[PDB]
Amino acid sequence: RTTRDDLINGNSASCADVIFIYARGSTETGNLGTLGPSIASNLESAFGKDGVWIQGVGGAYRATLGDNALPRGTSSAAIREMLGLFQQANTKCPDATLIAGGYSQGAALAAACIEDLDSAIRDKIAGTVLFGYTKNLQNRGRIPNYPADRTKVFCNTGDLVCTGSLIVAAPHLAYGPDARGPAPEFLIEKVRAVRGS
Numbered sequence: 001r002t003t004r005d006d007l008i009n010g011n012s013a014s015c016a017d018v019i020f021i022y023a024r025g026s027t028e029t030g031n032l033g034t035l036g037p038s039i040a041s042n043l044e045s046a047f048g049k050d051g052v053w054i055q056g057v058g059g060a061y062r063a064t065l066g067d068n069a070l071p072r073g074t075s076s077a078a079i080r081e082m083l084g085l086f087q088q089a090n091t092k093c094p095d096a097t098l099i100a101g102g103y104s105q106g107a108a109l110a111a112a113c114i115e116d117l118d119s120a121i122r123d124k125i126a127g128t129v130l131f132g133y134t135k136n137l138q139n140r141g142r143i144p145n146y147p148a149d150r151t152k153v154f155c156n157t158g159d160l161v162c163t164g165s166l167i168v169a170a171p172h173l174a175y176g177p178d179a180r181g182p183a184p185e186f187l188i189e190k191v192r193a194v195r196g197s
């Protein structure tokens with residue numbers, strides 16, 4: 001449900017084939033928030049419970065609303081927490097395909113961490129989904145250093161954070177249908193592109 005720590009808790013000797021690391025939006029609960037659980041249930045349908053590990057970014061990422069105003073759209077401590085999870089995935093399960101996502105402040109955190117990641121780990125992320133991406137205008141819909149074909153951005157018309165503002169309007173809270181269908185559909189397709197099936 002809203003907290004998932006499958007990577008931290010998982011046995012190295014029985015690594016999942018796919019590891020999904022997700023960062024929640026500002027003020028959301030657990031480490032998956034409102035959208036993460038919907039994506040998680042559909043990835044489990046696709047690869048089976050033992051086939052995919054779901055890991056939210058918890059720890060130092062407090063998802064404080066005010067940190068949306070910092071340079072990278074989140075704090076340095078939160079970025080360090082998410083890279084540490086990617087370094088644990090790469091050490092614990094070196095053959096797993098990685099996929100990732102973030103909502104709102106968590107989308108800026110996701111993009112900032114990918115930009116700073118060692119390229120051998122970054123290149124294992126087969127696909128990333130970003131909802132209400134707070135740096136959408138500033139980064140021109142891209143994640144720095146990461147291919148456009150592996151990126152999918154969900155930015156609703158009227159969601160002012162996609163158009164360079166930090167105002168929270170009702171379309172920013174309307175990503176539920178995307179998290180239920182198109183975003184897991186994109187992630188599963190990108191994993192099967194490289195893994196076959």
Ligand code: MAC
Pocket residue numbers: 021082083086099100101102109110111112113114128129
């Ligand atoms: C989507 C993502 O993980 O960025 Hg470090």
